[PDB]
Every structure is written in C-alpha cells, then in structure tokens.
Amino acid sequence: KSGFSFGFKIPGIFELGISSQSDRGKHYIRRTKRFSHTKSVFLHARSDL
Amino acid sequence: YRVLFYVDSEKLKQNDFNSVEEKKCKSSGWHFVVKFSSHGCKELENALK
Ligand SMILES: *[C@@H]1O[C@H](CO)[C@@H](O[C@@H]2O[C@H](CO)[C@@H](O)[C@H](O)[C@H]2NC(C)=O)[C@H](O)[C@H]1NC(C)=O
Numbered sequence: 256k257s258g259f260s261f262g263f264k265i266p267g268i269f270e271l272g273i274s275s276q277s278d279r280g281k282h283y284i285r286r287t288k289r290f291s292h293t294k295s296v297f298l299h300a301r302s303d304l
Numbered sequence: 305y306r307v308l309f310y311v312d313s314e315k316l317k318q319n320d321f322n323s324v325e326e327k328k329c330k331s332s333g334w335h336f337v338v339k340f341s342s343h344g345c346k347e348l349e350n351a352l353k
Contacts, residue, residue, distance in 0.1 A: 256343040
C-alpha cells in the first residue's frame with residue numbers, strides 16, 4: 256500500500272492540491288497430498304500322506 | 305511325533321512432522337504540504353507431515 260499527497264497555495268489567490276493512492280496485494284496458496292498403501296499376503300501349503 | 309513352528313512377527317512405524325512459519329511486515333511513513341505513507345506485510349506458512 257502506498258499513498259502520496261501534495262498541496263501548494265500562494266496568494267498573489269491560487270490553490271492547488273493533488274493526492275495519489277495505490278494499493279495492491281496478492282495471495283497465492285497451494286496444497287498437494289498423496290497416500291499409497293500396499294498389502295500382499297502369500298500363503299503356500301503342501302501336505303503328503 | 306515332532307512339531308516345529310516358527311513365528312517371526314515384525315512391525316515398524318515411523319512418523320515425521322515439521323512445520324515452519326515466518327511472518328515479517330515493515331511500514332515507514334514520513335511527511336514534512338507533503339504526505340507519504342507506505343504499508344506492506346509478508347506472511348509465509350508451510351507444514352509437511
Ligand atoms: C492445508 O493446510 C491445512 C492446515 O490446517 C491442513 O489441514 C490439516 O492438516 C493436518 C496435518 O496432518 C491434518 O491432520 C488435518 O486432517 C487437516 N485438516 C483438514 C480439515 O484438512 C491440510 O491438510 C492442508 N492441505 C490441504 C487442505 O490440501
């Protein structure tokens with residue numbers, strides 16, 4: 256935010272006044288998420304009689 | 305009659321959390337008809353899990 260004002264007057268009346276204001280703001284956000292799960296079950300059976 | 309059974313149970317758990325937040329704002333104004341004003345802030349926030 257920025258603002259400037261200037262005024263000058265001198266009688267011989269004459270009066271002059273100038274004001275300037277400029278405001279600018281920017282917001283940026285980002286969100287990333289990842290989830291991975293692996294489940295493996297290996298069962299082997301062998302029987303001889 | 306022989307019997308031999310072996311069980312090898314293993315469980316591992318690991319969790320890490322880190323968060324960093326930094327915020328800085330600076331504003332300066334000087335007037336001597338002359339008027340000047342400046343205002344600006346900055347904010348930063350980050351978190352990971
Ligand atoms: C954005 O940031 C927010 C900060 O509040 C996150 O919100 C929480 O984050 C914690 C971190 O582990 C989680 O346990 C909570 O479940 C979150 N809550 C909600 C309502 O989301 C958020 O995870 C971040 N990421 C996004 C929103 O995508």
